Amino acid sequence: MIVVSGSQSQNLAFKVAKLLNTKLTRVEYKRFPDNEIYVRIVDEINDDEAVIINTQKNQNDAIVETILLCDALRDEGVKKITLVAPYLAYARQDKKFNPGEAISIRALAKIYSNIVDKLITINPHETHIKDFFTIPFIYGDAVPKLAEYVKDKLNDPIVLAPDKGALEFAKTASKILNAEYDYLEIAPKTLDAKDRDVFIVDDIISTGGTMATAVKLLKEQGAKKIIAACVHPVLIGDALNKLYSAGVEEVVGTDTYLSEVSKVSVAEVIVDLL
Amino acid sequence: MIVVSGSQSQNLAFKVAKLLNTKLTRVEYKRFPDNEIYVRIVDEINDDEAVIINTQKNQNDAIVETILLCDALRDEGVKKITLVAPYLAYARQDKKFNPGEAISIRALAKIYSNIVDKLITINPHETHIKDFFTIPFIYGDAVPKLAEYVKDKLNDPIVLAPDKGALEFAKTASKILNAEYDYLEIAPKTLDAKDRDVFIVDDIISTGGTMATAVKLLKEQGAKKIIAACVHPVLIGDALNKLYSAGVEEVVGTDTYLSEVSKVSVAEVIVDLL
Amino acid sequence: MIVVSGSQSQNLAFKVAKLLNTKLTRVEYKRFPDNEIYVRIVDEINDDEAVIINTQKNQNDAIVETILLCDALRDEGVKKITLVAPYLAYARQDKKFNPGEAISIRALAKIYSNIVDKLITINPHETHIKDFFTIPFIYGDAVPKLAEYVKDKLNDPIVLAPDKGALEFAKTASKILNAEYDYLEIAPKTLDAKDRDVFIVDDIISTGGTMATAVKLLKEQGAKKIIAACVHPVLIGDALNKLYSAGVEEVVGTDTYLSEVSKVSVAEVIVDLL
Amino acid sequence: MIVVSGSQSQNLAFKVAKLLNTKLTRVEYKRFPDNEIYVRIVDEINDDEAVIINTQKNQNDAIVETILLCDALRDEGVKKITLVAPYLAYARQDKKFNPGEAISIRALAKIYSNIVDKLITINPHETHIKDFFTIPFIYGDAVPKLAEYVKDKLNDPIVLAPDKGALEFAKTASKILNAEYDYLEIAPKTLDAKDRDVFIVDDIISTGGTMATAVKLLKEQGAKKIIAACVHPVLIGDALNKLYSAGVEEVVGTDTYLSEVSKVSVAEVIVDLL
Ligand SMILES: Nc1ncnc2c1ncn2[C@@H]1O[C@H](COP(=O)(O)O)[C@@H](O)[C@H]1O
Ligand SMILES: Nc1ncnc2c1ncn2[C@@H]1O[C@H](COP(=O)(O)O)[C@@H](O)[C@H]1O
Ligand SMILES: Nc1ncnc2c1ncn2[C@@H]1O[C@H](COP(=O)(O)O)[C@@H](O)[C@H]1O
Ligand SMILES: Nc1ncnc2c1ncn2[C@@H]1O[C@H](COP(=O)(O)O)[C@@H](O)[C@H]1O
Ligand SMILES: O=C[C@H](O)[C@H](O)[C@H](O)COP(=O)(O)O
Ligand SMILES: O=C[C@H](O)[C@H](O)[C@H](O)COP(=O)(O)O
Ligand SMILES: O=C[C@H](O)[C@H](O)[C@H](O)COP(=O)(O)O
Ligand SMILES: O=C[C@H](O)[C@H](O)[C@H](O)COP(=O)(O)O
């Protein structure tokens, strides 16, 4: 297998290819004057199985660039193309939340199904979206790498899921830290934050309103050191400043989405799925 | 048939639907906080044949937005979807100009072929790109509307094609103005600009280097009033200022690509192809 | 005086320089790889009084590009620089609408005051913002050019201001069309739309919610042909589609802000203010 | 003193305020529908001396946002405002490299001089640009934090400055690693890479052409483990992929400019300058 760097995951692709003990296939990427995307496989591709690693922070650009990379790889032989999209755009469009809406991830699933043979992503908004794929849909989990990152800096804490739906993440981290978990329902459904360190984990932190709320509250409940983590740190606008004011000790996310707090890497999570 | 407005051609769609004596189907379009595209068909769709009019100035956004609109229309019935993309992005990637390059328009042609039943565009960079489509590929011509726009403001001129490859456009306009045509090869292959009004037409004006050159020269040859026209006025950066300095009297383009000189509309050119 | 083209008003600058019977001073503009702005005065500047015409659709880019152009012009002699900013960004920040907010136009007024000797803009959100300038603050009005555009296509109509604060524009247009004016307060404070053509004018159409409302209502009141006009057609997202569905016959704006309906030019309005 | 977070340095501001044992002043930042910037100081400001930390990756946005934050802080009391701009945009425009060009950093220096009382930046392209400021112009150095980062992972290496002008950085790092330094002039002016680990440091890595070259060469000269570092990792386009192919073992930059390799923080470098 050869590893192809997408434009948006050049360092993750490198880390992955390093773990796989492979040389990174040089791939040229540029924008024409009008801004159109240009991809070209510089190195020679003997192997006929390629792995494309390109996250989708810039949703549309990533989608079109992937469509073009596939065309260039097929045209170079490669019988099997595996697409690694750490952050998969449009996954929040599970269903028709209103009449006339378009189920985005479904439409794109159809396209991915005709251009790549396998799709691997990290912590999708919803795993049921696999039903839309006529190809293998793999999803790894980074919560554990997050749990490990903070296990070092939290004195016997309690894991908390901002909302009941994030409970699974809380539990997972809970296991790796040997702590107790629970979720907010506003106050924790069971446990009490009084005088304890807290580790709040969720899959995404977008505007930061969900966490800001949990953080502010937990502090008012007498919690001590609090660290907020998430797989995809979208952190829009002043999200970070929002959490920092709320009192968090630190905010930490992975490199599935570039942010000022993408301290944890999913490189290994990806390698084990290949 | 119903006319669906893409986000990038809202006024052209209106003009077209007006000519077709149809009501414009209200279509909701917005961006989520993270910038993902959101489309929703607000009005009810009884008819089962829709026409999508969305040019691609923002190449990637237009492509993904089209992919989502189709998904929403199929999901609403509509057995036949005709996509009108006045300006078709990635059409300059005709072939592999180097080993390892991706034939962009080919890859996207494959996608258009699986999501729409027919594709109509105005003055593609190359018409041979139809070979890539497993569906009807129609291409109209706006040169005539351009010729008509200036016939009014040029005292017995001569039509000129910047390069030999733009000759066809020159001739076409030439016919509608009853003037003589020719092309630059640097000087006009035959005719002479001395003391005459000149109408230079080409399909695209990107950086403006091609025209700036023709204009500067023709002026040095004693040409009088010069008007530069093109179907797609990409006009990147200081392109316009470049031509104005060169001495053009006016620059005029159509509405297939929004610019400060999109004075001519292709609405009717489109209607006749439907 | 010499006319300097900003990057965002290249065609307006040309039209203005044409009316002033002057040659447009060639100005180079480009972006470095990292996207920083680069300006260079290509032609020689003997005259010591320059006029910069650069609207601010891309607010921040326009502000910094203006800051750099001034530096280049002073460095070339030019004792007096007049800045023409058809659309003046940040003008909606009149005052502190909340404790801790920044009065944007005030901060920028201070900057304009130290880099240009005179500022001319078309239809500011609020004219009181002149108090913030330690230099001459001129503001022209395009409503008349708008009134003239439609006088040709509306059978004895009535001018309407969407809100009481847009009354002034309604009246102005009212005068040039000899029709009666009035404003919505929801229904017209006096006149009745029943069986009449309507011309609704306002200074800005952003999301389109204000007009969409007026249009829908007036139609329900039995109005006939309706045309919506505005000086600055910001028309965000699906604004146009919104108005078209509401039933407007046409939407028309000026070239102070590039849109698909910038059919009217303020070139002359500007020339008379110089 | 209070620490104000700019939108582009929210995490660095937090780290700095943490080191300063101060609470981060909550600052609201958002974009209106048309994209204009909106800033509001949410918390109360008793102290009359503020420190603004906002790097300029998005050059123009950062400049205007700073102009607005100052206006809001003065309006809140604050007699002294210190601006920390880790990465200072437009610093490469030292002088007029051509007739008619604008000395960008000079024009902006004038503005910074009238809105802030002190300016602190990390590793400017040129320090002579201080001549343009009528206020205190401080510049810290991150090379040492970079040297420290790699001292841990390089077996007795040699520090190399890509070009003679980056020599100073090489020497600095050289001191902290006790290794020998030198520069490329193509080959190293003195030392030889044969069988040795190499640490190449420069202030900026933009397109990556400078380093890619050094790396490729040094490898051809038999160098072993090579690590490339820089203060500002602009890393445009495929820059990283370019270096990785060239053979670098790792690329590392600071958080003055967000990138996928901003592993080293300048928080402390900044704190010591306050
Ligand atoms: N990229 C996005 N950002 C924010 N909201 C989204 C996005 N994509 C879809 N949505 C909406 O988010 C809501 C998600 O509901 P849920 O999955 O239950 O959290 C629906 O109203 C979706 O239309
Ligand atoms: N969007 C674009 N802008 C500029 N050049 C392009 C674009 N798409 C492709 N090209 C290149 O333009 C050249 C076109 O050659 P031709 O079609 O003969 O004019 C080839 O080197 C293409 O790779
Ligand atoms: N560019 C903008 N777009 C939308 N709203 C804005 C903009 N600039 C300021 N505002 C806000 O618009 C409101 C305008 O009130 P008014 O001037 O009475 O219409 C205040 O809450 C301002 O903060
Ligand atoms: N942001 C930038 N990116 C790339 N080049 C720039 C930038 N700003 C200025 N320049 C140009 O870079 C060259 C720098 O020369 P030097 O400072 O000797 O490396 C001059 O021709 C400048 O006009
Ligand atoms: O179930 C979990 C929710 O989807 C996330 O908590 C939510 O998407 C995060 O959004 P925000 O940070 O803007 O509150
Ligand atoms: O054959 C015609 C050429 O393709 C066009 O003249 C060319 O694409 C226009 O480009 P520019 O205005 O940047 O010179
Ligand atoms: O007084 C007039 C109002 O300021 C305008 O009607 C308003 O700003 C237009 O905004 P929108 O088109 O988003 O409703
Ligand atoms: O003196 C040092 C040079 O300014 C830098 O080496 C240069 O600016 C880096 O540019 P690039 O990575 O695009 O070669």
Side-chain angles (χ1 to χ4, degrees), chain C residues 46-101:
Chain C
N46 321 314
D47 192 309
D48 58 353
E49 206 210 79
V51 181
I52 297 176
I53 295 176
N54 193 38
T55 190
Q56 326 189 315
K57 181 185 179 180
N58 291 333
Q59 310 85 176
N60 309 335
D61 287 346
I63 292 169
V64 172
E65 153 172 31
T66 291
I67 289 173
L68 305 185
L69 288 163
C70 286
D71 184 83
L73 291 167
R74 294 302 189 188
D75 217 51
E76 201 78 334
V78 188
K79 293 78 180 58
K80 195 194 178 187
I81 299 178
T82 298
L83 170 68
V84 175
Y87 177 76
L88 187 73
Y90 293 102
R92 287 203 217 182
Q93 265 309 86
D94 298 302
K95 48 206 85 88
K96 289 216 303 177
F97 298 75
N98 286 279
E101 296 195 332

Side-chain angles (χ1 to χ4, degrees), chain C residues 92 125 162-163 165-166 202-211:
Chain C
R92 287 203 217 182
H125 171 69
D163 50 58
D202 199 348
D203 64 326
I204 307 180
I205 292 184
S206 185
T207 70
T210 302
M211 285 286 187

Side-chain angles (χ1 to χ4, degrees), chain A residues 32-34 36 38, chain B residues 92-95 97 101 125-126:
Chain A
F32 285 108
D34 55 5
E36 286 191 351
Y38 171 84
Chain B
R92 286 203 219 181
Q93 265 309 85
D94 298 302
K95 49 206 85 88
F97 298 76
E101 297 195 332
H125 172 68
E126 277 266 18

Side-chain angles (χ1 to χ4, degrees), chain B residues 26-44:
Chain B
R26 173 98 184 73
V27 186
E28 203 181 306
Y29 162 97
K30 72 167 192 180
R31 295 270 183 162
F32 285 110
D34 55 5
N35 204 43
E36 286 191 351
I37 302 178
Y38 170 83
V39 301
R40 165 156 175 275
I41 307 296
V42 178
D43 290 342
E44 300 248 301

Side-chain angles (χ1 to χ4, degrees), chain A residues 9-77:
Chain A
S9 290
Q10 291 172 62
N11 173 274
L12 178 55
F14 169 68
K15 286 183 167 175
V16 164
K18 211 155 174 283
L19 287 180
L20 290 176
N21 176 68
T22 295
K23 185 179 125 48
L24 206 63
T25 299
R26 173 98 184 74
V27 187
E28 202 181 306
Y29 163 97
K30 73 166 191 182
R31 295 269 183 163
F32 285 108
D34 55 5
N35 203 45
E36 286 191 351
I37 301 178
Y38 171 84
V39 300
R40 164 157 175 274
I41 306 297
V42 178
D43 292 340
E44 300 249 301
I45 299 182
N46 321 314
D47 192 308
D48 58 354
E49 206 209 79
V51 181
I52 297 178
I53 296 176
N54 193 39
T55 190
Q56 327 190 317
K57 181 185 179 180
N58 291 332
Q59 310 85 175
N60 308 335
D61 288 346
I63 293 170
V64 173
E65 154 171 32
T66 290
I67 288 172
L68 304 184
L69 289 162
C70 284
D71 185 85
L73 290 167
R74 295 302 188 189
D75 218 52
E76 201 78 332

Side-chain angles (χ1 to χ4, degrees), chain B residues 31-173:
Chain B
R31 295 270 183 162
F32 285 110
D34 55 5
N35 204 43
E36 286 191 351
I37 302 178
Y38 170 83
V39 301
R40 165 156 175 275
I41 307 296
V42 178
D43 290 342
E44 300 248 301
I45 299 182
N46 323 314
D47 190 308
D48 59 354
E49 205 210 79
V51 181
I52 297 176
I53 295 175
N54 194 38
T55 191
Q56 326 191 317
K57 182 183 177 181
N58 292 333
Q59 310 84 175
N60 307 336
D61 287 346
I63 293 170
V64 173
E65 155 171 30
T66 292
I67 289 172
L68 304 185
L69 286 163
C70 288
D71 185 85
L73 291 167
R74 294 302 190 187
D75 217 52
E76 202 78 333
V78 188
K79 294 78 181 58
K80 195 193 178 187
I81 298 178
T82 299
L83 171 68
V84 175
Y87 176 76
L88 188 73
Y90 293 101
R92 286 203 219 181
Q93 265 309 85
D94 298 302
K95 49 206 85 88
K96 288 217 303 178
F97 298 76
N98 285 277
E101 297 195 332
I103 298 177
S104 307
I105 190 60
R106 168 179 59 182
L108 300 172
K110 291 176 183 170
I111 300 180
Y112 291 130
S113 298
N114 307 322
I115 65 172
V116 293
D117 311 302
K118 183 185 185 182
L119 174 56
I120 299 175
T121 184
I122 309 297
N123 298 84
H125 172 68
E126 277 266 18
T127 43
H128 97 264
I129 67 173
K130 60 184 164 196
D131 299 321
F132 300 128
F133 297 80
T134 83
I135 52 170
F137 183 81
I138 312 315
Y139 45 99
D141 176 32
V143 176
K145 275 65 191 172
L146 284 171
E148 258 149 48
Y149 175 84
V150 305
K151 93 155 305 172
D152 169 57
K153 53 268 279 182
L154 281 177
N155 174 39
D156 180 17
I158 50 176
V159 183
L160 277 198
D163 50 58
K164 176 177 158 66
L167 184 42
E168 36 155 341
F169 305 142
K171 177 183 174 188
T172 296

